[PDB]
Amino acid sequence: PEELRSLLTTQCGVISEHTKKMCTRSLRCPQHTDEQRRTVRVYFLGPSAVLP
Ligand SMILES: [Zn+2]
Secondary structure, three states, X not given: OHHHHHHOOOEOOOOEOOOOEOOXXXXXXXXXXXXXXXXXXXXXXXXXXXXX
16 A cells, blocks of 8 residues: 555556556556546545545
């Protein structure tokens, strides 16, 4: 969780339909938006883990 939380800072992390898991490329990777990465943080680290 520590490094995962640190992952989402530069790494996409956007979970591809749960099964494929977090996206491993950078945030900017595809059309995976800020919301898309947000969705993951709030999922993994907490409902109130909306980091910028
Ligand atoms: Zn991505």
